[PDB]
Design an enzyme around this catalytic site. Structure first.
Site, short mmCIF file in Angstrom:
data_model
loop_
_atom_site.label_atom_id
_atom_site.label_comp_id
_atom_site.label_asym_id
_atom_site.label_seq_id
_atom_site.Cartn_x
_atom_site.Cartn_y
_atom_site.Cartn_z
N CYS A 13 18.46 -0.71 -78.85
CA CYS A 13 18.11 -0.52 -80.25
C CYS A 13 16.68 -0.97 -80.52
CB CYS A 13 19.11 -1.28 -81.13
SG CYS A 13 18.71 -1.27 -82.90
N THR A 42 24.85 0.56 -89.43
CA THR A 42 25.28 -0.48 -88.53
C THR A 42 24.95 -1.85 -89.10
OG1 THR A 42 23.22 -0.09 -87.37
CG2 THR A 42 25.22 0.94 -86.49
N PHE A 61 23.49 -4.07 -78.71
CA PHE A 61 22.37 -3.23 -79.11
C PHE A 61 21.97 -2.25 -78.01
CE2 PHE A 61 22.11 -7.20 -81.36
CZ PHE A 61 22.17 -6.75 -82.64
C1 FDE Z 1 16.57 1.20 -87.48
C2 FDE Z 1 17.73 0.66 -86.72
C3 FDE Z 1 18.54 -0.37 -87.24
C4 FDE Z 1 19.47 -0.54 -86.21
C5 FDE Z 1 20.58 -1.52 -86.28
C6 FDE Z 1 21.68 -1.66 -85.32
C7 FDE Z 1 22.83 -2.54 -85.45
C8 FDE Z 1 23.26 -3.51 -86.53
C9 FDE Z 1 23.61 -2.35 -84.30
C10 FDE Z 1 22.86 -1.40 -83.58
C11 FDE Z 1 23.05 -0.79 -82.37
C12 FDE Z 1 22.67 0.05 -81.39
N1 FDE Z 1 21.50 0.67 -81.67
FE1 FDE Z 1 20.35 0.42 -83.40
N2 FDE Z 1 19.30 0.25 -85.17
C13 FDE Z 1 18.23 0.99 -85.51
C14 FDE Z 1 17.87 1.90 -84.62
C15 FDE Z 1 18.05 2.49 -83.44
C16 FDE Z 1 17.36 3.52 -82.80
C17 FDE Z 1 16.17 4.35 -83.26
C18 FDE Z 1 18.09 3.62 -81.51
C19 FDE Z 1 17.84 4.56 -80.35
C20 FDE Z 1 16.62 3.91 -79.69
C21 FDE Z 1 15.99 4.81 -78.68
O1 FDE Z 1 16.72 5.34 -77.81
O2 FDE Z 1 14.76 4.98 -78.75
C22 FDE Z 1 19.08 2.64 -81.60
C23 FDE Z 1 20.07 2.35 -80.54
C24 FDE Z 1 21.25 1.48 -80.61
C25 FDE Z 1 22.25 1.43 -79.55
C26 FDE Z 1 22.23 2.21 -78.25
C27 FDE Z 1 22.31 3.70 -78.44
C28 FDE Z 1 22.81 4.37 -77.18
O3 FDE Z 1 23.46 5.42 -77.39
O4 FDE Z 1 22.55 3.87 -76.01
C29 FDE Z 1 23.25 0.44 -80.07
C30 FDE Z 1 24.51 -0.01 -79.39
N3 FDE Z 1 19.07 1.95 -82.75
N4 FDE Z 1 21.74 -0.99 -84.16
#
Ligand code: FDE
Ligand code: FDE
Lengths: 450, 452
Positions: free
Chosen positions: A395, A263, A388
């Site tokens: 994330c 990503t 995210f």
């Molecule tokens: C080492 C690393 C680096 C990164 C980067 C990034 C970029 C440029 C964009 C993004 C995104 C994202 N993430 Fe990211 N990332 C990471 C990681 C991760 C993990 C281990 C997870 C699951 C957490 C928990 O559940 O504990 C994520 C997570 C993530 C999400 C949500 C998943 C679901 O199925 O709810 C989204 C929309 N991420 N991302």
């Protein structure tokens, strides 16, 4: 409390033929443009509702009513990532355990440790491009995954993939693409037990062994460091005093190799596309990079000061979020938006590229690349910008990505001038993530030494 | 003095359950027993039980007039596919005592002389597998032990050949069985059993029940073709107390029970026995001295197996340290006070922590963690109820004569035909389903080039 829109049905196959493309996410966006803020989507055995407006998604992000769901896509990815952080259910043993053990590795101070190693690989990228002869060009998505895979490997596990020492894609990544490609193709298989899929199923296992063999090489190189891998091996669960099970630890390594480089790799490639197509935006970020990166190698503080580069990064992932969707289910019976009832267990999908093009929040120029929307980060109302994920299942590598992408993008702008010499037409390949395919540029070195 | 009972930390309406959210619960309870002592209470939402670790109280629990075998929540979960079989039956159930009287003849001394030929069949297949490995290859011990022990229960019990050594990956019955046993153990630690996270588990569990029953349907039908083995007594025998033969539903449960219990603990047992030997080369060298001395024929006879007494002591010292069936449960016939200190109401349940009972300093001395086969040189010297690897009383292990003869024969021939190298300096890792096994134990085997 009215009835929900639904696209064309094909007898007993329901809506499954409509995603019979190599680009299912873009086909859903069309259906979203054709049907609006919510539509029902049926498959032979599954039913899901796709949300596109911030009005409905704002209630969906309430963790009192909705919890992270494993879409049919994630259940297929669970075949090689298991119960690691990404494909784990919230209420199963290893999510809470590992979330709390790995969270120190993504604190702001842990980032200060990563900076030297991130600088290592970024210098390798600059040196690769500086050594191109005048006729050669650069494959943007390929050199970005070379870089992002190497970063997550060095910082996380002290393991050198040496992707820049390989004209070919790295073997881990090449079978990973095939495994992610297989997973997406299974969402379009009506009868997955047809013998026709016997080669496809055996290749799938062949690719998982490739991913696991590398992980055992990472484990064998250890058992001197305080990285993410030390924390997986040493962290105790406070309630039981025990570290992560070895089978989980292999599962978390896979998760971080995949989610922790792909990503980010799509991200940087999209940011370079929008810059090279919007040349005034490119010189404004090039001015900021020339201003802030005054040393032969950048410091941690200097990255924190690349405000305009960061806005370029936020506006790219707004337009093309490299992880395009996340799924929810209904903890308890509820009515959505005061119009749509849901029984307990009913499933929703947040169509992230559609949320970010909601005319009612961003104005009537949603499709244009304007980084200046994020000059005021606070202006945008909650749950309108969700690249995210959401909440406790958002994330975990949310700051690691921003620092890596900012640092790398900053040095490219400091060291090169970029020409879109082919007039590249944007083509978005879908594994489960998004990346531009065959995107190429030329880079004239500004001849600034390192 | 009557006194309150120890209990580890509680986590609200979840009670003590969070403490066992690990992949190895029995070794976790051994940690709790080590810190709270000989007995502690353990609460879960619907259940409560007290865990015993010391001989003084476990000898009291082994009193059959006061305590009878209890189905722990673990055995109740196995009952979902073990049903009314010998192992998951209450002593007071019609089909326990009935089936017990019908099948006990099959584990007599007289039966043992008949099995010896079939056991040698399997054992020779194992030896020949190791002799045909190329020089660089190694041996994964528990996987080859399950190949041996499972083929043994199939042939001796049902005249059925699994041909486990003609397969590279595990037999499909073995994979579905472990996944079923793994499910049963994991349901014990689970807070909210209707969470969507467990739909695959319920599915996969049912998928694993059908495969085990299908395999039993293949064994039963394969006999209607075609003997005087255990299956013949199941189908043709009649209970000496009531004159009823077994229910056709029940016979299906007995075949499953013996396929599981009749190979799983013997394969772990041998794996641990082989483990301690590569770790104590003076003990290993002494055991191969005796096998080279007694096994003078290309294949061993029944009398020769009974003459391998140090090999037997190796096996007993192995199973003391790691009892592969690590616990059995009891309940209180009537209100009684345990040790004069702990009052128990009628129906309260107890669990015997066998690896902790075998680690009692008051009985075995101050070297219980040392692997010394010579504790079993003096058969009488052991106190009563200090060594309980096969359960207790009328619910004790029906096949402990059978296991010992199988394990000693195989362990004997391995010592006669091979030298064993611990080429990885293997670190002991004990995987827990509901039983115990070493997980990644590998060794290399030099052929002594002795013919068969
Ligand atoms: C080492 C690393 C680096 C990164 C980067 C990034 C970029 C440029 C964009 C993004 C995104 C994202 N993430 Fe990211 N990332 C990471 C990681 C991760 C993990 C281990 C997870 C699951 C957490 C928990 O559940 O504990 C994520 C997570 C993530 C999400 C949500 C998943 C679901 O199925 O709810 C989204 C929309 N991420 N991302
Ligand atoms: C065939 C076979 C073989 C064997 C072996 C063995 C070894 C090595 C170890 C063992 C063990 C045991 N077991 Fe065993 N085994 C068997 C079996 C059995 C049965 C059937 C039972 C049940 C009994 C009654 O109860 O009746 C047992 C049983 C047994 C026991 C008990 C259980 C309870 O719960 O109490 C124990 C502890 N086993 N084991």
């Amino acid at each position: 409390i009215k009835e929900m829109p639904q696209p064309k049905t094909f007898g007993e196959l329901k809506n499954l033929p409509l995603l019979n493309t190599d680009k299912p996410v873009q086909a859903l966006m069309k259906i979203a443009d054709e049907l609006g803020e919510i539509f029902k989507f049926e498959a032979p055995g599954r039913v899901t509702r796709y949300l596109s407006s911030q009005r409905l998604i704002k209630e969906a992000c309430d963790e009192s009513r909705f919890d992270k769901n494993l879409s049919q896509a994630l259940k297929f990815v669970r075949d090689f990532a298991g119960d690691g952080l990404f494909t784990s259910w919230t209420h199963e043993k290893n999510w809470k355990k590992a979330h709390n053990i790995l969270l120190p590795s993504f604190s702001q101070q842990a980032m200060k440790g990563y900076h030297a190693m991130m600088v290592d690989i970024a210098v390798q990228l600059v040196q690769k491009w500086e050594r191109l002869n005048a006729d050669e060009h650069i494959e943007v998505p390929e050199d970005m995954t070379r870089l992002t895979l190497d970063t997550i490997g060095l910082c996380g596990f002290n393991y050198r993939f040496n992707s820049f020492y390989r004209d070919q894609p790295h073997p881990f990544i090449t079978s990973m693409v095939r495994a992610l490609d297989e997973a997406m193709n299974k969402l379009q298989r009506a009868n997955p037990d047809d013998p026709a899929y016997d080669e496809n199923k055996r290749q799938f296992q062949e690719d998982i062994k490739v991913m696991n063999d590398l992980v055992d090489k990472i484990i064998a190189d250890r058992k001197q460091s305080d990285d993410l891998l030390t924390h997986m091996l040493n962290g105790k669960d406070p309630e039981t005093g025990e570290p992560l099970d070895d089978e989980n630890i292999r599962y978390q390594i896979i998760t971080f190799l995949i989610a922790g480089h792909e990503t980010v790799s799509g991200w940087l490639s999209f940011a370079l596309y929008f810059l090279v197509k919007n040349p005034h935006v490119l010189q404004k970020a090039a001015e900021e990079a020339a201003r802030v990166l005054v040393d032969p190698v950048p410091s941690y503080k200097q990255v924190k000061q690349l405000k305009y580069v960061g806005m370029v990064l936020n506006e790219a992932i707004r337009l093309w979020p490299t992880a395009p969707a996340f799924s929810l289910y209904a903890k308890e019976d509820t009515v959505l938006g005061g119009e749509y009832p849901l029984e307990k267990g009913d499933e929703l999908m947040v169509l992230i590229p559609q949320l970010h093009r909601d005319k009612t929040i961003w104005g009537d120029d949603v499709e244009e690349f304007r980084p200046e929307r994020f000059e005021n980060p606070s202006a945008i109302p909650q749950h309108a910008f969700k690249p995210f994920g959401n909440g406790q299942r958002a994330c975990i590598g949310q700051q690691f990505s921003l620092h890596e992408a900012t640092l790398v993008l900053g040095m490219m702008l400091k060291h090169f001038d970029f020409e879109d010499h082919t007039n590249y037409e944007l083509d978005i390949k879908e594994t489960l993530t998004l990346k531009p395919e065959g995107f190429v540029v030329k880079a004239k070195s500004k001849k600034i030494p390192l």
